[PDB]
């Protein structure tokens, strides 16, 4: 079976999402996020030399194929530059990838 | 659910000049649970992941009988395999 699984859900912080502008007017609204979950085959093995460990570590990532602009409904007036909208990478399938393991604030 | 098994591995060292010598090691292999979502508020990925890793191991030394100088090789071998944080 597919080593992952895809499903749109609502993150609690994004349930509903709040975003503020200058002069303190806020736009809120639920924002569904793409969720990839599953069981990726992983392994750790000892090797020669340095580093002595090798990690075939993989997590359920999504296959980004587009970008989604959700907007926020319940908007306070004067919503300016940054808000009324937000950009979310979007796809339709999940794969086992180690990219979510490299960007630890690098 | 999860699963992370210890597996025996026979590895053959075939270095030109040095004697052919086999080594029996153990490695971890399995399927652990993980889920990831692109967090645009932080503009990165939010990960909550398990990976089948070695919690404890044991270094294995061996001499490699080479014609131009014997060598000393060091390899870790698994003792307990388990699904643990991928980042630690």
Distance CA B6, CA B37 (A): 30
Cβ atoms A19, A83 nearer than 8 A: yes
Q: How far is B28 from chain A (nearest CA, A)?
A: 5
Residue with tokens 């508020």: B41
A87/B contact by beta carbon, under 8 A = yes
From the CB of residue B36, how many other CB atoms can be counted at a distance below 10 Å?
Answer: 25
Q: How many domains does chain B have?
A: 1
**CATH number of the domain encompassing residue B55:** 2.10.90.10
What does this entry list as its resolution, in Å?
3.5
Distance CA B73, CA B15 (A): 13
Q: Tell me which residue range forms the domain holding B81.
A: 3-88
Token pair of B3, please? 């699963």
Instruction: Check CB contact under 8 Å for B86 and A33.
Output: no
Hey, which bits of chain A come out as E strands?
6-10, 17-20, 26-29, 32-46, 53-56, 59-71, 85-97
Say whether A101 sits in a helix, a strand or coil.
Answer: helix
Distance CA A51, CA A46 (A): 9
Which chain B residue shows the shortest CA-CA distance from A91? B38
Distance CA A19, CA A85 (A): 9
| Bond before A16 cis per omega within 30 degrees | yes
Token pair of B49, please? 């992941």
Query: In the PDB record, what is the listed experimental method?
Result: X-ray
DSSP B72-84: EEEEEEEEEEEEE
Within 8 A by CB and 6+ apart from A105, the residues are none
């Amino acid at each position: 079976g597919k080593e992952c699984e895809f499903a749109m859900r609502l993150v609690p912080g994004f349930n509903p999402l709040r975003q503020v502008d200058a002069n303190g007017k806020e736009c809120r609204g639920n924002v569904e996020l793409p969720f990839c979950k599953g069981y990726c085959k992983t392994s750790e093995s000892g090797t020669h030399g340095f580093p002595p460990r090798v990690q075939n570590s993989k997590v359920c990532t999504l296959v980004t194929t587009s970008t989604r602009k959700v907007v926020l409904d319940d908007c306070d007036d004067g919503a300016d530059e940054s808000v009324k909208f937000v950009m979310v990478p979007h796809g339709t399938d999940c794969e086992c990838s180690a990219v979510p393991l490299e960007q630890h604030h690098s | 659910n999860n699963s992370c098994k210890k597996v025996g591995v026979e590895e053959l060292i075939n270095e030109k000049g040095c004697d052919l010598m086999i080594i029996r090691i153990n490695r971890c292999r399995g399927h652990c649970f993980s889920f990831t979502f692109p967090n645009p508020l932080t503009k990165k990925y939010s990960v909550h992941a398990k990976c089948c890793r070695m919690v404890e191991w044991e270094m294995l030394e061996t001499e490699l009988k080479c014609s131009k100088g014997n060598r000393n090789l060091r390899i870790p071998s698994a003792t307990q395999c388990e699904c643990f944080d991928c980042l630690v």
